[PDB]
Amino acid sequence: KMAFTLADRVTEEMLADKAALVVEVVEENYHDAPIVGIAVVNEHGRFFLRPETALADPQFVAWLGDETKKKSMFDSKRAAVALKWKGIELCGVSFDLLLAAYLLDPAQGVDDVAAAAKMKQYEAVRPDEAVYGKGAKRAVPDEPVLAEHLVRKAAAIWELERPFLDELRRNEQDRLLVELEQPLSSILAEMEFAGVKVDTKRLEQMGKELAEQLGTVEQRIYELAGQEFNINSPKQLGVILFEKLQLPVLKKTKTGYSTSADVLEKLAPYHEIVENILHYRQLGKLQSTYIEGLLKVVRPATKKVHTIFNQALTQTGRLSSTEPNLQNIPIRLEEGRKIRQAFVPSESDWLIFAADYSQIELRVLAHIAEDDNLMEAFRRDLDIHTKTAMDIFQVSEDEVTPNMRRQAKAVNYGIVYGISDYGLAQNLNISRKEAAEFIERYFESFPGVKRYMENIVQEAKQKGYVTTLLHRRRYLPDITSRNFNVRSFAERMAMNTPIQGSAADIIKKAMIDLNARLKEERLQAHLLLQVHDELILEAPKEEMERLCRLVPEVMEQAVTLRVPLKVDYHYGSTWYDAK
DNA sequence: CCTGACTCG
DNA sequence: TTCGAGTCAGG
């Protein structure tokens, strides 16, 4: 039972200086999406307002934009961005229930108020999916029903604020919420709304040339196979490779023969077709995802793409990026890398500026493990891959070949991801006996790291969770499973999450610090993207000199570790050229 | 819808 | 039998 006022005009008591606020955007992608209703709960009552009314009411808009009028919300970024597309500013958000729930336990996958309410046994609100339905049945219900849902969500936020803040504090996560994630949410809202401009003429031309090349590679594959088939079908491909051409079966999955890139690479001594097939699938992914998929989400009038950074999704503390994902744009092979030529500045005589942390996960490892030998390598800035090579190959620096260094690189990151000798041998296509020795030698060379890996798994067993530098947590209830596979997965998460998660913490704080500096110096430069360990900005060309100093300094100084942090940077006329 | 394959950190 | 994401085509 819950009384509320279904209001048809705004009143003074609706504008109190503390309220739970709901600004409901039901489309998953909130860019330029309709606002279907509004609810306010405060000391004076519970109210529902129509958007057309309240959003045209100068007093309500003033209240929204007034920083001293504090609002508690769930997913404030969604409301903030949807409001931006209507030219309205939302300020004063002092508590975000989505982010609070996310910090308390990312595993719960909270993405509606009812799901957060569940964490505190609060049942006086329905799941969104219950009210709106799913798939083709999805629809906004009749006003009375909508109104009650929005009011119940606001009522829930109102009552849940203190219980959530109280638990965050005993978890040592209250500052993580209010000083890191909540400020970052506003910064991400700005980035999403600004968007990134795309050179569609260039993308469309690339797509036309790619179609041509696909056709050619395709026919060559059929010629080598002696038959036509669907190359994009791992099932049909498997019949061609392992039945028709009788190539060895190196791996099976639950569904059948594996045709993974790793397997096809290993088959190259048997038949040249596998190299053609790998190329074809590369080209096809470029076409389908980064040409076609990208062109579908460009807003035709402004030629911008507006990603959504999911801030409350990953288990480690990272962001993700969707519709489109701008955190997986090709870079490692030159053919794919050219896609980046189509990401351009939003203004004339602006440039793209890209700054990345060098080896942040390995530096975080050095810090947390307190390994003398690894800390000293970074403190002296020795090449960490060449150093590991000297140890795992047992040679002097002058004897380290480029291939040995590449193998050591694989050992250095593999350790951070819990690699076994099997995985390392498969990765490097080397002897498993050898791979096991690489690992044995690594741990003899970096005994602090070995101790850290043992200790963190013990900590996980004892506490039930692991923590990052800035007190993010991930629970690991499988860490004591009797099942080898299940327990092993949890142990590798114990090892890896504090590293990936602490690196996430660091770059998040850098974004907040950087944004502060940019505004302080009245620079026009602004953030466009974050890609886990790098930040991409655009700015008028005049500001490059300043950014060359400002951006890396702010990023290097974000946190102080037991080793230095290092940032590299580049700028140019497109994302491609900022290299 | 899931699986597996390509993409990034 | 190396971690964490999103999108795509095929089935």
Taking the CA of residue A494 and the C1' sugar atom of nucleotide C11, their distance in angstroms comes to 36
In a 3-state reduction of DSSP, which class is residue A570? strand
Give the nearest nucleotide to A493, CA to C1': C3
> DSSP labels for A338-357?
GGGGGEE-SSTTEEEEEEEE
Enumerate residues 6+ apart whose C-beta is below 8 A from A179. Answer: none
Kindly state the tokens that stand for A152.
């119940």
A497 CB and strand C closer than 7 A: yes
Q: Report which of A161, A219, A184 is spatially closest to residue A470, judged by C-alpha positions.
A: A184
Protein residue nearest nucleotide B6, by CA to C1': A285
Instruction: Return the CATH superfamily for domain A194-308.
Output: Taq DNA Polymerase; Chain T, domain 4 (1.20.1060.10)
A143 near A187, Cβ under 8 Å?
A: no
Instruction: Return the CATH superfamily for domain A1-193.
Output: Ribonuclease H-like superfamily/Ribonuclease H (3.30.420.10)
A500 CB and strand C closer than 7 A: yes
A251 CB and strand B closer than 7 A: no
What was the experiment behind these coordinates? X-ray
Taking the CA of residue A322 and the C1' sugar atom of nucleotide C5, their distance in angstroms comes to 10
CATH 3.30.70.370 for domain A309-359+504-578: yes
Strand order in the sheet with A304-305: A304-305, A196-198, A343-344
Distances from the Cα of A206 to the Cα of A200, A253, A339, A341, A343, angstroms:
10, 35, 8, 10, 13
A253 CB and strand B closer than 7 A: yes
CA distance A308 to A30: 9
Give the nearest nucleotide to A287, CA to C1': C8
Taking the CA of residue A205 and the C1' sugar atom of nucleotide B7, their distance in angstroms comes to 21
A401 CB and strand C closer than 7 A: no
Give the nearest nucleotide to A333, CA to C1': B7
End-to-end Cα distance, chain A: 60
Give the nearest nucleotide to A328, CA to C1': B8
Nucleotides of B under 7 A from a protein CB: 3-9
Protein residue nearest nucleotide C3, by CA to C1': A417
Protein residue nearest nucleotide B4, by CA to C1': A234
Q: From the centroid of its chain, how far is CA A59?
A: 38
CA distance A28 to A40: 22
Distances from the Cα of A387 to the Cα of A232, A265, A395, A440, A450, angstroms:
42, 29, 10, 15, 17
Domain ranges for chain A? 1-193, 194-308, 309-359+504-578, 360-503
A480 CB and strand B closer than 7 A: no
Resolution (A): 1.6
- The answer, yes or no, to whether the previous bond of A477 is cis (omega within 30 of 0) is no
A103 CB and strand C closer than 7 A: no
CA distance A224 to A276: 9
CATH number for the domain formed by residue range(s) A360-503: 1.10.150.20
Q: How many CA atoms lie within 13 A of A118 on its CB side?
A: 12
- A135 secondary structure, DSSP code: G
Kindly state the tokens that stand for A566.
């290092």
CATH topology match: A309-359+504-578 vs A360-503: no
Q: Report which of A319, A360, A352, A316 is spatially closest to residue A556, judged by C-alpha positions.
A: A360
A282 CB and strand C closer than 7 A: no
Taking the CA of residue A392 and the C1' sugar atom of nucleotide C1, their distance in angstroms comes to 21
Give the nearest nucleotide to A106, CA to C1': C4
Q: From the centroid of its chain, how far is CA A575?
A: 19
A508 CB and strand B closer than 7 A: no
Give me Rg for the CA atoms of chain A.
27
Give the nearest nucleotide to A414, CA to C1': C2
Tell me, what amino acid is at A18? K
Kindly state the tokens that stand for A196.
């990134």
Protein residue nearest nucleotide C5, by CA to C1': A320
Taking the CA of residue A191 and the C1' sugar atom of nucleotide C7, their distance in angstroms comes to 22
A448 near A454, Cβ under 8 Å?
A: no
CA distance A156 to A95: 13
CA distance A20 to A125: 14
Q: In the block, which residue shows the tokens 């819990």?
A: A418
- Strand B interface, A 381-440, C-beta < 7 A: none
Taking the CA of residue A8 and the C1' sugar atom of nucleotide C6, their distance in angstroms comes to 42
Enumerate residues 6+ apart whose C-beta is below 8 A from A513. Answer: A554, A557, A558
Neighbours of A211 (CB within 10 A): 12
Protein residue nearest nucleotide C2, by CA to C1': A419
Q: Packing angle between helix A384-392 and helix A432-445, nearest 10 degrees? A: 110
Give the nearest nucleotide to A251, CA to C1': C1
- A256 secondary structure, DSSP code: S
Protein residue nearest nucleotide B3, by CA to C1': A255
CA distance A390 to A412: 13
A350 near A489, Cβ under 8 Å?
A: no
Kindly state the tokens that stand for A537.
């900005």
- A34 secondary structure, DSSP code: P
